[PDB]
Structure formats: structure tokens, C-alpha cells
Design a protein around this ligand. Structure first.
Ligand SMILES: NC(=O)c1ccc[n+]([C@@H]2O[C@H](COP(=O)([O-])OP(=O)(O)OC[C@H]3O[C@@H](n4cnc5c(N)ncnc54)[C@H](OP(=O)(O)O)[C@@H]3O)[C@@H](O)[C@H]2O)c1
Ligand SMILES: COc1ccc2c(c1)c(Cc1no[nH]c1=O)c(C)n2C(=O)c1ccc(Cl)cc1
Length: 318
């Protein structure tokens, strides 16, 4: 149940999403990561941004200690936050994630976003007028620092997140490149299916990893409440009824059959266990075309405050 990455390592094709908004107590991340491993999740997606790597690492430690898994059975992802793009900050940021999680390595380290921010430990640097402070960094130099993290053994694989085709090509065409990104983790669901970007990634042996594949958590700081609810889509709901599954399972299976590695966040014990049932049924070729028809170019995150960023990913066609 894995895909082979272009560096030879293997990534489980279903991943557990661990982000929860700050109102959720941090003990929950510990509890649900254990439930996820107990349910069969082996790929766990975290990040410095999520303020939960300590709890996710504790959950992994606990399941290793009780004999449920070994460390090599777990695929753990962290991400470099955008205030750490300057190359001298990359390894210290990774080492800090490893210390928090009490891991010797991450299986995957990503550049969280191409949209560089003012360097510092402050995650949301803002000016005297409350505006986020951008930074200008050559992401090829960030990538060179990521490559050194892989050679140092601290990350088994390295990749990117929220890149568009042009930004991927900047890395791929970098002189003296040693490691291609193994993946590009991007927003991907039936209302924003990234088919052109997926075709490009396939042509370069880069895995597309889908986040907000269930339509996001609809956080009201970020999500227009008038945006359509993905899991209420009539086509998804009709397919769920036809297959005797759930709209969530349809949305996850859609990604698996188009060669996309799919993440699924749930902090609910029964939904966690439901999502691993994605492997138990199949969509027909006609089902897949019907879902392909749902694309609305819908980004669940209101990105107006970032649209002026030089590395804003959504100005290009893809
Ligand atoms: N690289 C990035 O920039 C980036 C951005 C966004 C997300 N991510 C990663 O992707 C992960 C998931 O994306 P997401 O956080 O946007 O959430 P999601 O996977 O789109 O799921 C969204 C909501 O679906 C609900 N859900 C889960 N399973 C369900 C089921 N079987 N039936 C019905 N509802 C179900 C969950 O609510 P309950 O918890 O109540 O089940 C969750 O809040 C994140 O946790 C994070 O790891 C990365
Ligand atoms: C749909 O929800 C979204 C969408 C985008 C998101 C996020 C959640 C999150 C935060 C988060 N929540 O859960 N896990 C995560 O990492 C970030 C850090 N995003 C980006 O950086 C991003 C890239 C391009 C653009 Cl234009 C805007 C934002």
C-alpha cells in the first residue's frame, strides 16, 4: 500500500493529517495519533507550524513501546516553516522539529510553502500596520540546504508543498541539483483536482500529495462560509449511496485511483477508522470521470492577503 519515491524510499499512499486549530487542546493530537496508528495509518503528516510535533512524536513513541509498530513502519512528515527559508536556518529548524518529536530522523521534510516570510521564530511576522512581512529568498538555496539535511541523515526524503509547475521547474532545472523533490503536497479535492499539475508531476516522477482532500476543516478565520461544502456535493453523495460508502471515502478513493497520495485529517475515533476503509472498494472508470467533472477551481483558503506575494502559487494556469 505504498508508492516508490524517486529516491528509492516508500511512502504509504494514505496519510493521517494532524493539523487542528489552536482551540483544540494539544492532548488531542497525542490521543488521535495513537488511534490513527491503531486503525492502520502508517503515514503521519505534521509540521512545525502545527504546534503538535511533540504530541505526535509521543504517540509514535508510545506505539513503538507497546509493540504495535517499529520506527521503520512509520512514515513521519515534517515541514519547514516559511520564516526559515534562508539556507542557514534550514537545518536548525529541522533539528528543532526532531528534538520536539524525539525522533532521530523524519521520513519526509517539506518546504511548507514557497511564500517566504521575515526570518525569525515568530511564525506570523507583521509590521506596524498589522501586515504580514514577506521575505525574498532564492528557493534554490533553500533546496540546497534541504539536500544537505538528507545527506546528513536527518530527512530520508525531501520535497515541497504548495508549489506550482514553474516553481517545481526552478528546482528541477537548478544547476548541480542532487535530489529532485519526491513530492509536491498541494490542495487537491474534487472541487480543485489539479489535473494539469498532476500530469506534470507524473512526467517528472514527483508524487502529488493531496491535502484538504475532504474539503478542509472550514476554519472560519480562513474559509469563506459561503463556499460549497465538499462532502455535501450531490455527485459525491450519490456515489456514496451507490457504493454503500461515505462521501469522504469516495473523495479519498478518487485520489488513490488517479495516482495521488491522499491525506485525511480526523480527530474522531470512528471517522479515523472509517477512512482506512478506502482500500476496501473501487470506483468505476465512469465514476472517476463523473468526479473529474466537479472541478470548480475552488481554493478553500482565502489567500487575498498573500496574492501580492512574488511566489504566490495561483497566478499561473497551474
Ligand atoms: N501543506 C499544507 O499547506 C497543508 C495545508 C492544509 C492541510 N495540510 C495537511 O493535510 C491534512 C488534512 O487536510 P485538512 O486538515 O484540510 O482536513 P481534511 O483531510 O480535508 O478533512 C477535513 C475534515 O473532514 C472531516 N472528516 C474526516 N474524515 C471524515 C469522514 N470519514 N466522514 C466525514 N467527515 C470526515 C474531519 O473532521 P473530524 O476531525 O471532526 O473528523 C476534518 O476536519 C492537515 O491535517 C495537514 O496535515 C497541509
Ligand atoms: C485549505 O486549507 C489551507 C490552505 C492553504 C494553507 C493551509 C490550509 C495552511 C495551514 C494548514 N492547515 O492545515 N495544515 C496546514 O499546513 C497553510 C500553511 N496553507 C498555505 O500555506 C498556503 C499555500 C498557498 C496559498 Cl495561496 C495559501 C496558503
Amino acid at each position: 500500500q505504498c508508492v516508490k519515491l524517486n529516491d528509492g524510499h516508500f511512502m504509504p499512499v494514505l496519510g493521517f493529517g494532524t493539523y487542528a486549530p489552536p482551540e483544540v487542546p494539544r492532548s488531542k493530537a497525542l490521543e488521535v495519533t495513537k488511534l490513527a496508528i491503531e486503525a492502520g495509518f502508517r503515514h503521519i503528516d505534521s509540521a512545525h507550524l502545527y504546534n503538535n510535533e511533540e504530541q505526535v512524536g509521543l504517540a509514535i513513541r508510545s506505539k513503538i513501546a507497546d509493540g504495535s509498530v517499529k520506527r521503520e513502519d512509520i512514515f513521519y512528515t515534517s515541514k519547514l516553516w516559511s520564516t526559515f527559508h534562508r539556507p542557514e536556518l534550514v537545518r536548525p529548524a529541522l533539528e528543532n522539529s526532531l528534538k520536539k518529536a524525539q525522533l532521530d530522523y523524519v521520513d519526509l521534510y517539506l518546504i511548507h510553502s514557497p511564500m517566504s516570510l521575515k526570518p525569525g521564530e515568530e511564525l506570523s511576522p507583521t509590521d506596524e500596520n498589522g501586515k504580514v512581512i514577506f521575505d525574498i529568498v532564492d528557493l534554490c538555496t533553500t533546496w540546497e540546504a534541504m539536500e544537505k539535511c538528507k545527506d546528513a541523515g536527518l530527512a530520508k526524503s525531501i520535497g515541497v508543498s504548495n508549489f506550482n509547475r514553474r516553481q517545481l521547474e526552478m528546482i528541477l532545472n537548478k544547476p548541480g541539483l542532487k535530489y529532485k523533490p519526491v513530492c509536491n503536497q498541494v490542495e487537491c479535492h474534487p472541487y480543485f483536482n489539479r489535473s494539469k499539475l498532476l500530469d506534470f508531476c507524473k512526467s517528472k516522477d514527483i508524487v502529488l500529495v493531496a491535502y484538504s482532500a475532504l474539503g478542509s476543516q472550514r476554519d472560519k478565520r480562513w474559509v469563506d462560509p459561503n463556499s460549497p461544502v465538499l462532502l455535501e456535493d450531490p455527485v459525491l453523495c450519490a456515489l456514496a449511496k451507490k457504493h454503500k460508502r461515505t462521501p469522504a471515502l469516495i473523495a479519498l478513493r478518487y485520489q488513490l485511483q488517479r495516482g495521488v497520495v491522499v491525506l485525511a485529517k480526523s480527530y474522531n475515533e470512528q471517522r479515523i477508522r472509517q477512512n482506512v476503509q478506502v482500500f476496501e472498494f473501487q470506483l468505476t472508470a465512469e465514476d472517476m470521470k463523473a468526479i473529474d467533472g466537479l472541478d470548480r477551481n475552488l481554493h478553500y483558503f482565502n489567500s487575498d492577503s498573500f496574492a501580492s506575494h512574488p511566489n504566490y502559487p495561483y497566478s499561473d494556469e497551474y
